[PDB]
Amino acid sequence: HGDCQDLQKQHSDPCALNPRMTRFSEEACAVLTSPTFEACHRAVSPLPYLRNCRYDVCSCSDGRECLCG
Amino acid sequence: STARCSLFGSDFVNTFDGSMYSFAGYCSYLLAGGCQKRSFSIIGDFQNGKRVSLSVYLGEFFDIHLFVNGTVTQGDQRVSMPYASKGLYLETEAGYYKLSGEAYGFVARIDGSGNFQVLLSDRYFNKTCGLCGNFNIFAEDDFMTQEGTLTSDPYDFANSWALSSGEQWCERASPPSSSCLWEQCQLLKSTSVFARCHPLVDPEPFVALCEKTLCECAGGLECACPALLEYARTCAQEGMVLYGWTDHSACSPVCPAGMEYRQCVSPCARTCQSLHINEMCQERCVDGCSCPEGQLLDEGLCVESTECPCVHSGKRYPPGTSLSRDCNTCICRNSQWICSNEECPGECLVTGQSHFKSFDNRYFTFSGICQYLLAR
Amino acid sequence: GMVLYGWTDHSACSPVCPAGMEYRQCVSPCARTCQSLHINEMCQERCVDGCSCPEGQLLDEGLCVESTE
Amino acid sequence: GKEYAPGETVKIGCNTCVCRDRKWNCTDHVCDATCSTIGMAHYLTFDGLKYLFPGECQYVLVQDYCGSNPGTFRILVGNKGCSHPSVKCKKRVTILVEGGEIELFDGEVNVKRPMKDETHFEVVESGRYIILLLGKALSVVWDRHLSISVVLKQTYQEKVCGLCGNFDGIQNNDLTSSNLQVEEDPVDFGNSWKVSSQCADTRKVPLDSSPATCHNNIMKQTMVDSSCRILTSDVFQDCNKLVDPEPYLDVCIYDTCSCESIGDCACFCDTIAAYAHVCAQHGKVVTWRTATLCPQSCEERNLRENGYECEWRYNSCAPACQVTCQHPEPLACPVQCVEGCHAHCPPGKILDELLQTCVDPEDCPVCEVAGRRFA
Amino acid sequence: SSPATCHNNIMKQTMVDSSCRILTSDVFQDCNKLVDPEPYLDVCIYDTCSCESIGDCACFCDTIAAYAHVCAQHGKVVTWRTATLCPQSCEERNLRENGYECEWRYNSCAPACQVTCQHPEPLACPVQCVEGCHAHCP
Numbered sequence A: 001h002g003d004c005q006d007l008q009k010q011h012s013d014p015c016a017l018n019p020r021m022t023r024f025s026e027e028a029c030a031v032l033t034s035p036t037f038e039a040c041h042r043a044v045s046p047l048p049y050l051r052n053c054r055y056d057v058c059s060c061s062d063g064r065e066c067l068c069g
Numbered sequence B: 001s002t003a004r005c006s007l008f009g010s011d012f013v014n015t016f017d018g019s020m021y022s023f024a025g026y027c028s029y030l031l032a033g034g035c036q037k038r039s040f041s042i043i044g045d046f047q048n049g050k051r052v053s054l055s056v057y058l059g060e061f062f063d064i065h066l067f068v069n070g071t072v073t074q075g076d077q078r079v080s081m082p083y084a085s086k087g088l089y090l091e092t093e094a095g096y097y098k099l100s101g102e103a104y105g106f107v108a109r110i111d112g113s114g115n116f117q118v119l120l121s122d123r124y125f126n127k128t129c130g131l132c133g134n135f136n137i138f139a140e141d142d143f144m145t146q147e148g149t150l151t152s153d154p155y156d157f158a159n160s161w162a163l164s165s166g167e168q169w170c171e172r173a174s175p176p177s178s179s180c181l182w183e184q185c186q187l188l189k190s191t192s193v194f195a196r197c198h199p200l201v202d203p204e205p206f207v208a209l210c211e212k213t214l215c216e217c218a219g220g221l222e223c224a225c226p227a228l229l230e231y232a233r234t235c236a237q238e239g240m241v242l243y244g245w246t247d248h249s250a251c252s253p254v255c256p257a258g259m260e261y262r263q264c265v266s267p268c269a270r271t272c273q274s275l276h277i278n279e280m281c282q283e284r285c286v287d288g289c290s291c292p293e294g295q296l297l298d299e300g301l302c303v304e305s306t307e308c309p310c311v312h313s314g315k316r317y318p319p320g321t322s323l324s325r326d327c328n329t330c331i332c333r334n335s336q337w338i339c340s341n342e343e344c345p346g347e348c349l350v351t352g353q354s355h356f357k358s359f360d361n362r363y364f365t366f367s368g369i370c371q372y373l374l375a376r
Numbered sequence C: 001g002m003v004l005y006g007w008t009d010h011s012a013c014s015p016v017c018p019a020g021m022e023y024r025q026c027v028s029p030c031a032r033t034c035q036s037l038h039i040n041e042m043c044q045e046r047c048v049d050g051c052s053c054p055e056g057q058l059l060d061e062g063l064c065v066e067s068t069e
Numbered sequence D: 001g002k003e004y005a006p007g008e009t010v011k012i013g014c015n016t017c018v019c020r021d022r023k024w025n026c027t028d029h030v031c032d033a034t035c036s037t038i039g040m041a042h043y044l045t046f047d048g049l050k051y052l053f054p055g056e057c058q059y060v061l062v063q064d065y066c067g068s069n070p071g072t073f074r075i076l077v078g079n080k081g082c083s084h085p086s087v088k089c090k091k092r093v094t095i096l097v098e099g100g101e102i103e104l105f106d107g108e109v110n111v112k113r114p115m116k117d118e119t120h121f122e123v124v125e126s127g128r129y130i131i132l133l134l135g136k137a138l139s140v141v142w143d144r145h146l147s148i149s150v151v152l153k154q155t156y157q158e159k160v161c162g163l164c165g166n167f168d169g170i171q172n173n174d175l176t177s178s179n180l181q182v183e184e185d186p187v188d189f190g191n192s193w194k195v196s197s198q199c200a201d202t203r204k205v206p207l208d209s210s211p212a213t214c215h216n217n218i219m220k221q222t223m224v225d226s227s228c229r230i231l232t233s234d235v236f237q238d239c240n241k242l243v244d245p246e247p248y249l250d251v252c253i254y255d256t257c258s259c260e261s262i263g264d265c266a267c268f269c270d271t272i273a274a275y276a277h278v279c280a281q282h283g284k285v286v287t288w289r290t291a292t293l294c295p296q297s298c299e300e301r302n303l304r305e306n307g308y309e310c311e312w313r314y315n316s317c318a319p320a321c322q323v324t325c326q327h328p329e330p331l332a333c334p335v336q337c338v339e340g341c342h343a344h345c346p347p348g349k350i351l352d353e354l355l356q357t358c359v360d361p362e363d364c365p366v367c368e369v370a371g372r373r374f375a
Numbered sequence E: 001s002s003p004a005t006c007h008n009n010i011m012k013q014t015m016v017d018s019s020c021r022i023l024t025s026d027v028f029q030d031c032n033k034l035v036d037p038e039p040y041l042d043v044c045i046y047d048t049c050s051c052e053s054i055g056d057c058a059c060f061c062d063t064i065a066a067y068a069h070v071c072a073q074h075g076k077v078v079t080w081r082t083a084t085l086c087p088q089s090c091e092e093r094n095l096r097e098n099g100y101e102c103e104w105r106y107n108s109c110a111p112a113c114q115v116t117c118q119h120p121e122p123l124a125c126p127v128q129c130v131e132g133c134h135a136h137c138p
């Protein structure tokens, strides 16, 4: 559809706009690099899945279900 | 060039341009900060529809929380006052708690009533974003939601700025559904005390909120006076300060002792532990308080000029409280110790492996192997 | 010849006068009120101690009332 | 250390001494002194005392409104956010001589209130420094980043006060506070010269050397000591006879542990620059900058239109004040050995004022009336 | 991210992000269209947390120079070295006997291979845009 506006520069850090929730995002989205998941670290690299968690929690309104999503 | 937005009354708001309304929330809304390159943010914490605490945020590393009862923190610590740090001087002023940032540009107070004030600068023109609205002279289109669209409902506009952090999740805000004898609000429309602020601002909206508050009137004279300070401060900042109001019906804005509320006090506020440098107080009039004229201020309260205590090593001593050195001693006058010189014995120590101490005090190490002459 | 300035702030016992209680030094005896012609240049009297009421109130025969009344 | 045949002389900075009957006989001449900021937390009084005092508001460097005489000048050295020696540090200096301020901040000088006695008011830009002359005796030398120095000739003897002592020739009592009491440690001494009474005086650092940013690595503590042990390495072995590198080393250990530098190396080159500057005042010019150790260039401002006329070079210490169509007569610049980048044009075609290109002497002012440039 | 050297200060991890966010500042904006500055940012954040510099600053300028090297291969030469950001000089080797004849200058990328009495014929130098200090004799 040609009436949709083309987005300009994508923005990487969403919690540069909500600095209240910076400690919680880093603290919570850290189980992925922890011995709870240690078996799976050799099957799929948890690199993209960590920054996805950080972005999801900093950005979305209800971070309780964005964390476990 | 410097504007002013304030949060006052009980559940009221004013912006950088004038369009002013009400809102009572729960979720630490965003009061100011540019929304293309953020680089700092003022966040206003509420609780149960009230106003508790105030906080800044630099980048993503440094916090500071200021609170309404004068207690200050660090994010998880409990710092004292004044506490200068990486920029951001917390202080006190004519009785109110000031947070000054001049590298970035803003100054924020909290008075005894818990009313907030923040003054921005000219380089944020057409770039501010938060709940205090954008900063352009045109005063009507100042309800841009975070999406960028424009609305008309105060609540739908102001719910788009709430900020949540981890443990604290917040809900949607709904206007309170509670409706409702003298009309002293027109005191802005009759007396000639305020008559000179008329050609700069329009006194209608203040009367509007004043009757809104008159609806409640959970008290005798609390109905109107919080609606009256703000108009004074606004037309004071507008270019001409009112002189000698509060002499007719006002409700005596509170500060602890002395209570000498007055306009045009010098923020320098001469005390007696000072160097009496003149000429270097080029600051505008600020309302506030002080304590009469014949007294000088101490850190806690203010005392008569005859009793400024002296200081040695950070201790405080009452006048006429001579301390004793080994060699001499002298007496505290009005913050001016006056000792008399006198030669006192000297010692030349020689200890350790090879560690000397001269007769005056010079310490050193020599370590040579022979016989030497130590004194004569 | 040298009038004392700003005492009474330390230990005095507040010399008594009926209303206002604004005891102060160097007050003009002209005592401006609203029932007058606001004629200036004819207040050539030396300092006199006495009483008045703040600044925003003008004196009537009994007491002083705000300028509006 | 060395032999000296009878009748031979020696000069020490300011005075000359000669040998007479196995004892040195020589003359006395109280001459000028210098109070300076060694680095960015340490001070050096007029009689040569070193102390540590990190603060963050406006203080008093040196004034003379304290004795039983009418004051003249006053220099205030309020610094911004330098309670910790990080790279974000910035400093400001305000000078109140007769009726003006000068505001040394960032780029250059201001004149925010003209002085009625510009008859001896000069500003000179030589090397990498700026030199201010404010009267018969008073001078100020500025690095443009963080080191401020002040020179007073013998007239102001025993007549000033501040964070620089009272200049009488005794070290012991030159640590007195503003209320006529001799303190013990520098931290409670320096709170008394604070201008505004709402600063939150600095408390005290209880620990010993190697501040907390160090001693938790000793992989970083043992690189810093060797990295700036070049104060004794090979070029400074002639300096070390005349001035001892005991205090400057201890400056370098500080504000290098406590200074997280990322792409800006100025936190380290400036201490070595200070020590080298002090050597130059004793006639021991040194060269210490390599291609891999705090390198410096001055070819950027070299007339990009053509540029082949290479009119700029980096010299050892480049004698200080050179005449031009600005002050066509020698001045009294108390430095004479300014390190920096220098212009060495031939005897004719002296250097200009504004465009930084040597030109023939025609472009001098037409007249000196009203003290204007007049092209 | 932020090795154990970082995330224990975040007065240094907030000082090293903005210290080398200059890859998107004003000069490299031409490159950002043709090569994205995403992997080189992650290169810069690393080995600056874990690289304590005292008097030597090559640990940081080299990343920026590598990214500039990448850009110039795409015909988008840039100039980023100032007097207060990774300064460089080359006039030390300028014939100290006289010195007034300046034959060395610092150019943008100083095209690589020039003929002399070493190989009087063009070579195959697959860079041709070597930044450095250069000699521009007639």
Ligand SMILES: *[C@@H]1O[C@H](CO)[C@@H](O[C@@H]2O[C@H](CO)[C@@H](O[C@@H]3O[C@H](CO)[C@@H](O)[C@H](O)[C@@H]3O)[C@H](O)[C@H]2NC(C)=O)[C@H](O)[C@H]1NC(C)=O
Pocket (backbone or CB within 6 Å): B052, B067, B068, B069, B070, B071
């Ligand atoms: C000014 O207001 C603030 C908040 O309105 C007051 O801070 C609050 O102080 C109480 C008293 O200590 C704190 O309660 C304590 O919390 C800890 C941690 O949960 C708990 O272990 C204790 O048993 C106690 O319940 C409360 O957390 C704290 N709220 C904050 C810091 O947000 C402050 O005391 C007031 N000032 C004065 C002078 O009272």
Ligand SMILES: *[C@@H]1O[C@H](CO)[C@@H](O)[C@H](O)[C@H]1NC(C)=O
Pocket (backbone or CB within 6 Å): B126, B136, B137
């Ligand atoms: C504010 O900025 C926008 C975009 O830069 C511009 O379109 C608008 O006209 C500006 N408003 C004013 C009042 O200058």
Ligand SMILES: *[C@@H]1O[C@H](CO)[C@@H](O)[C@H](O)[C@H]1NC(C)=O
Pocket (backbone or CB within 6 Å): D020, D025, D026
């Ligand atoms: C030094 O020499 C001068 C003249 O040569 C003489 O007047 C003076 O007394 C001498 N002083 C000493 C200490 O020998």
Ligand SMILES: *[C@@H]1O[C@H](CO)[C@@H](O)[C@H](O)[C@H]1NC(C)=O
Pocket (backbone or CB within 6 Å): D314, D315, D316, D317, D318, D319, D344
């Ligand atoms: C510095 O300048 C002086 C005077 O012009 C000169 O004698 C000296 O050789 C110069 N130093 C260098 C390294 O060129």
Ligand SMILES: *[C@@H]1O[C@H](CO)[C@@H](O)[C@H](O)[C@H]1NC(C)=O
Pocket (backbone or CB within 6 Å): E106, E107, E108, E109, E110, E111
């Ligand atoms: C770099 O060299 C080229 C070719 O010699 C020249 O055209 C260009 O002007 C030079 N750049 C600078 C900044 O001198």
Ligand SMILES: [Ca+2]
Pocket (backbone or CB within 6 Å): B017, B133, B134, B135, B136, B137, B138, B139, B140, B141, B142
């Ligand atoms: Ca607006």
Ligand SMILES: [Ca+2]
Pocket (backbone or CB within 6 Å): D047, D165, D166, D167, D168, D169, D170, D171, D173, D174
């Ligand atoms: Ca002395």
